[PDB]
Design a protein around this ligand. Structure first.
Ligand code: HEC
Ligand code: HEC
Ligand code: HEC
Ligand SMILES: C[C@H](CCC(=O)O)[C@H]1CC[C@H]2[C@@H]3CC[C@@H]4C[C@H](O)CC[C@]4(C)[C@H]3C[C@H](O)[C@]12C
Length: 71
């Protein structure tokens, strides 16, 4: 399957799956979550444990605005 882009108004956010599969071999960090996770995602989650928060805890991955968001 293809990578996906979240169409944030301030700039597209690419989600590169390959890098994540490699860097986060614990797949259950994202997969086999209970229902509601597709509906649940949004800005709050992205800037929290959904994207940015994990990068901050793991000490790797983009944590600056222009590193995630790119026109
Ligand atoms: C969140 C950070 C994830 C982690 C960690 C893992 N996966 Fe993932 N996966 C995630 C998303 C958002 C998507 C769909 C969008 C995309 O970019 O592909 C997927 C997709 C898969 C797929 C289908 C991919 C394909 O057919 O090319 C598989 C088979 C899959 N995910 C498995 C998988 C495994 C085994 C992981 C751990 C090693 C893993 N993923 C990590 C989100 C995230
Ligand atoms: C942990 C559970 C994570 C979640 C949830 C998300 N990301 Fe992530 N990401 C994570 C790590 C440990 C890394 C480092 C990977 C590396 O090899 O450098 C990353 C990396 C990225 C990258 C950069 C990939 C690259 O090739 O440099 C991007 C662009 C990225 N992550 C985006 C991103 C988004 C948009 C997420 C939510 C939708 C997201 N990540 C979740 C760990 C985790
Ligand atoms: C990746 C780790 C991100 C970092 C660092 C920052 N943002 Fe972000 N932002 C990210 C995603 C994946 C999303 C979309 C959420 C979704 O619904 O899919 C967003 C969203 C925003 C928004 C709202 C956009 C919209 O509703 O169309 C804004 C205004 C925004 N982000 C701004 C922003 C700024 C200023 C940041 C640095 C302080 C920043 N983001 C960091 C992913 C990531
Ligand atoms: C559930 C995990 C981990 C974050 C968490 O624990 O909540 C998060 C991390 C990345 C999240 C995905 C980002 C891309 C998609 C955003 C959509 O608007 C909702 C579905 C997707 C596919 C999201 C579903 C789910 O919300 C995921 C896979």
């Amino acid at each position: 399957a293809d990578d996906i882009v979240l169409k944030a108004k301030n700039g597209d956010v690419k989600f590169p799956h390959k890098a994540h599969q490699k860097a986060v071999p614990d797949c259950k960090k994202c997969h086999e979550k209970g229902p509601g996770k597709i509906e649940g995602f949004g800005k709050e989650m992205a800037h929290g444990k959904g994207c940015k928060g994990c990068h901050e805890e793991d000490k790797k991955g983009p944590t600056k605005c222009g590193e995630c968001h790119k026109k």
